[PDB]
Amino acid sequence: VQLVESGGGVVQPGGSLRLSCAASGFRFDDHAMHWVRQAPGKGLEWVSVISGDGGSTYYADSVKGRFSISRDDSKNSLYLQMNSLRTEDTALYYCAKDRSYGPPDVFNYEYGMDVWGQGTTVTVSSASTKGPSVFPLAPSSKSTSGGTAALGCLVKDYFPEPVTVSWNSGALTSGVHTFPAVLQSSGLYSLSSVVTVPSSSLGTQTYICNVNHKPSNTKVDKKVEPKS
């Protein structure tokens, strides 16, 4: 009764992709299937449906002609072939199961979409890939207040979205808070992770942010110390 997907990633505008979705726990000749995309932070948007029992497909109007969709009940899979993408297709893509097949066109009054997948991220652009630039944001009296003071690391200007910053190789879990990355007009991401620590302990112990960029192979440790 599970739905998994695969096939996402980063392509430049003009490329092509092949998304796939594998199901488990039922037969495919009793259910229709849906591909539903969703831009990050926004509402849903239906993309396509295929009926059970062979083929009667439909696409949304903005995606007409560019896409194609098939199923395979020999392998229990869905394929969604995407050709000639544009920059407004950066989204999560969800593989949803429609109980009681037949396009909602003929089997009205009861369609639903009961079980859902976990989605797959796809983004497009020419910005390509780039490594992060790191600075330490020092603990300061303007950040200090009474018993505690905050220090952190600013990791900026990178395209390949999944990036991680830890504190002291994963040691400090108190006060460590990485904020959501921000997407600049330049097209590159940026973020800053900060942690508070007793003001008696400004420079005393080790506070080294471990920056790892997994699409690239960047690994750098930066120490944060009070301002000179």
Partner: protein
Amino acid sequence: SVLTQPPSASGTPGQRVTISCSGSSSNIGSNTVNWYQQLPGTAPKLLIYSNNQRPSGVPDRFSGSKSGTSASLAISGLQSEDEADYYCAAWDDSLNWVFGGGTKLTVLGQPKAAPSVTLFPPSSEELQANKATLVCLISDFYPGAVTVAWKADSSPVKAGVETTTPSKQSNNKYAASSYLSLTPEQWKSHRSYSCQVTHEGSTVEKTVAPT
């Protein structure tokens, strides 16, 4: 083919809250509605199909009504786990499934917290890197309607700033961040900058001066 619905609804925990949708004639006229709940981060759930039929696993607090060309979810008594998006669906003879606009929920329970603000100037290595970025962090401000304004020595600025949307933490309050882009010569040009945040009329501002 638009399925107009309100963007956000509200209510105290423990009473009936309705959620409407309005489609024309191919949407809700000759078709049926579904309702989908989207908790933050997860996959969407199914709530109501065929205008009033909850499937197995949906508790008996949700109902469903379809009257002519409008539809309505009706949550009977809010709780601490129903703070989510809710979408209505249709089919539209136009030959395309249509979706709602979504509606958040605002249990409005947690008292009013104070947005803790923290501001950082561009570090030294960044100064040597021929660039400059101001960093304004906001945290712990449970009602999430924060906004930000940036200040050079006396004037407001509106260029080179990026602002995160508020994000929920573990303690179920919010956090946000904003960045200011500057060339170091502009960094030393003005004697000081500041980040101000406004929240429920109230305002708190931080300020830093170059060295």
